[PDB]
């Protein structure tokens, strides 16, 4: 458990309906939501691969499952019943455990993705922005939609705004 | 000027079970379990099945008078009221073997 | 006339999913006594 979902970030956003993770920006040009494309696409691909692995590793055998025995072969019938019950119990146990462990790790994966996105934005902004504490960053320098698209893209220019940010700090 | 990182939430009531926590609502889910059927016996591999309505295999293979009503079949279907078999009393020797043999015939 | 795979005494199964719980006799997804096996693919829904 990484501490982001239900943690530094106390809740989800119902206004972000275009992706799993993303940003909310407040500028003088306006407010808006925008999901991160790279992280969401990577998460979708990985989760699709996981679901496909679960589906396509449990596939084999024609099989008939259904034999008939008379009243003088009760031992063989009991052996068949034992085989059927054992296979059934093993497969139920495997299915339950697989679902239970894969859920925990999916949730951990999403937590990790949120935490990594937040740390990526932290490292790029450095001291040009202050951490409010609720999970967000207030800028020391006024920067427009081009700046926000740069910080979302991953190509923020620290020295371009460092001089302006130092005065406001 | 503020930029905030966040995640998605919705009005989904899908619940999943986790090893530490039970009844965790998640935004998206899939179902790995099938619990539905059409309630009707139909053809495997295109081949229609052999339906012995009022007969069992013994009656059909011996020629019971009430079974006169057939080249390939995917599977054989019997019924809980298939009581018309060996009309004359007696023992059908290796009957289960014969049924196992006749289960898969092209 | 329903040409389809994986018939069961109750009825035919038309799915690509690995598990089913309609009937253990099949002619096919594997049989379990699970009443629910839902795999979480999304986030923990927090409002």
């Amino acid at each position: 458990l990484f501490g982001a979902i239900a943690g530094f970030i106390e809740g989800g956003w119902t206004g972000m309906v275009d992706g799993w993770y993303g940003y909310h920006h407040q500028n003088e040009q306006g407010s808006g939501y925008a999901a991160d494309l790279k992280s969401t696409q990577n998460a979708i691909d990985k989760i699709t691969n996981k679901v496909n692995s679960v589906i396509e590793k449990m596939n084999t055998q024609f099989t008939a499952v259904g034999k008939e025995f008379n009243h003088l072969e009760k031992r063989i019938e009991n052996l068949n019943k034992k085989v059927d019950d054992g296979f059934l119990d093993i497969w139920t146990y495997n299915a339950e455990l697989l679902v239970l462990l894969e859920n925990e790790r999916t949730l951990d994966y999403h937590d990790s993705n949120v935490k990594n996105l937040y740390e990526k934005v932290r490292n790029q902004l450095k001291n040009n922005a202050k951490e409010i504490g609720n999970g967000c960053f207030e800028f020391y320098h006024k920067c427009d939609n081009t700046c926000m698209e740069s910080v979302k893209n991953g190509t923020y220019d620290y020295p371009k705004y460092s001089e302006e940010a130092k005065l406001n700090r | 000027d503020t930029l905030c990182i966040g995640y998605h939430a919705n009005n989904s009531t899908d619940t999943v079970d986790t090893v530490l926590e039970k009844n965790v609502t998640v935004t998206h889910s899939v179902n790995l379990l099938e619990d539905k059927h059409n309630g009707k016996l139909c053809k495997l591999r295109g081949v229609a099945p052999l339906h012995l309505g009022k007969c069992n295999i013994a009656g059909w293979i011996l020629g019971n008078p009430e079974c006169e009503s057939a080249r390939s079949w995917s599977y054989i279907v019997e019924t809980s009221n298939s009581d018309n078999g060996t009309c004359y009393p007696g023992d059908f020797i290796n009957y289960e073997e014969l049924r196992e043999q006749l289960s898969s015939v092209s | 006339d329903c040409n389809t795979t994986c018939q069961t005494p109750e009825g035919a199964i038309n799915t690509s999913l690995p598990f089913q719980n309609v009937h253990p006799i099949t002619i096919c997804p594997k049989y379990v006594k699970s009443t629910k096996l839902r795999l979480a693919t999304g986030l923990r829904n927090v409002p």
């Epitope: 309906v17 275009d18 992706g19 | 998206h28 899939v30 | -």
Partner: antibody
């Protein structure tokens, strides 16, 4: 494929129900969009319903008059219009993103599968 | 709202670019532009999704990009079956999808 139903004549102030049925693309894990095209005008997005029916989104021009419902058991999507006007004469389409198994259905999924549409 | 060209024309074998823009704002990849094609009497067919997606069954001639503050659809090698009313769908925020007026492409020749 997608097959639509309903549609016909209506008085200026009546109600009508449209249905859209799909087969072969996992209806239970897809968003369903309802769009309209007036004769002489372009397409106009009307409504959208989520995979589980919890999220329903409407256009500004039809908010409060239209309702979207979903029955996953029958693989059906329903759009009900009340207080119909004269400007609502158009051809209605149901659209969705046809995928065999969707692990994440979002509102911005592309509108790939389009039904033939009905007339109103 | 979404603003499109009133009408555009092209010669066979040439290249044609269609632009989609906002009344007030800049179209970006976060607006998820989609390009549809509709021949009369037929349901619309999606050509491009998310400015780079090509559904299976669509020729590689049709391509998409973000030109300046607009979304651009480029069709190279115009043919006789490429005369239709092309539509642009843009997503604004808080679940709002708006379609364009529709640019009818007339292929001269």
């Amino acid at each position: 494929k997608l097959v639509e139903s309903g549609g016909g004549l209506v008085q200026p102030g009546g109600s009508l129900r449209l249905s859209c049925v799909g087969s072969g693309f996992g209806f239970s894990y897809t968003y369903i969009n309802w769009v309209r095209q007036a004769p002489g005008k372009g397409l106009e997005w009307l409504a959208a319903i989520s995979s589980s029916g919890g999220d329903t989104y409407y256009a500004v021009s039809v908010k409060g008059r239209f309702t979207v419902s979903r029955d996953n058991s029958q693989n059906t999507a329903y759009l009900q219009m009340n207080s119909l006007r004269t400007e609502d004469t158009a051809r209605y389409y149901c659209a969705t993103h046809a995928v065999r198994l969707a692990v994440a259905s979002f509102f911005v999924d592309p509108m790939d599968l389009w039904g033939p549409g009905v007339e109103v | 709202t979404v603003i499109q060209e009133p009408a555009m024309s092209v010669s066979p074998g040439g290249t044609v670019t269609l632009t989609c823009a906002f009344s007030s704002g800049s179209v970006t990849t976060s607006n998820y532009p989609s390009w549809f094609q509709q021949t009369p009497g037929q349901p619309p067919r999606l050509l491009i999704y998310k400015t780079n997606g090509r559904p299976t069954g669509v020729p590689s001639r049709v391509s998409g990009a973000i030109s300046g503050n607009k979304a651009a659809l480029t069709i190279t090698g115009a043919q006789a079956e490429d005369e239709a009313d092309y539509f642009c769908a843009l997503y604004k925020s808080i679940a709002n999808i708006r379609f364009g007026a529709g640019t009818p492409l007339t292929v001269l020749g």
